[PDB]
Symmetry: C2
Subunit: 131 residues, 2 copies
Amino acid sequence: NVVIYADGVYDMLHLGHMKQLEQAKKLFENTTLIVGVTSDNETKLFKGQVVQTLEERTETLKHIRWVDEIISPCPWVVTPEFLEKYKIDYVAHDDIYAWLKRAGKFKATQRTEGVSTTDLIVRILKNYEDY
Amino acid sequence: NVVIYADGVYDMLHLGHMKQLEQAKKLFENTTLIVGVTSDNETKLFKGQVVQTLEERTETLKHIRWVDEIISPCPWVVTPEFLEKYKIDYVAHDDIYAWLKRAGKFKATQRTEGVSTTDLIVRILKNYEDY
């Protein structure tokens, strides 16, 4: 059994997150997938705007079949100490990660374009011709 | 083991669908949850607008841990013949259902207000004061 770790904001969870979580879950035949959900204050300070609170973004992730455990809030920066505390074998994510590639603990997951929740609102608005 | 059936549009799947699916899944200690996804043409003709195609709405549902099987497209009207073909013990849904209450096959699931994907876009727009 292999312990995988993925982290992220997971704001307005869409098929993109789900597919990336699925891919992480399936890196190995027998895995335990831990998902870390970044904090509101830190995501806003370092990355950008978040619609949903930590509590909302977390409650929604618990419905994704690929998720075995959630760390909420997770650290903004993943540390080697953090890997050992939770006995993580691999970190799955789409440099600040060089030390992970060096431990052989880096596993790249892919992003799907064009399926985000915001992409969906755009498709709603395209029913209203500009004139 | 109890076979439960829930149907719906599942457009822009949100925590509301997920919680309603969760509740269906857990009506009994040992269940098999079948989720039917209504067709595009029929949903548009009888109910209202749908952003996502059948194929999109279905691919997203497969990520919800509570879902064991999907019928896609499902019939717009559920029939007693339909219940027997799939050996459904119960139909979970939030009249056109009287015959289900009469078979003792009706199980009511609740809607959560205020967590829909559209509710989320509204919260985005509220950062832009009207003046």
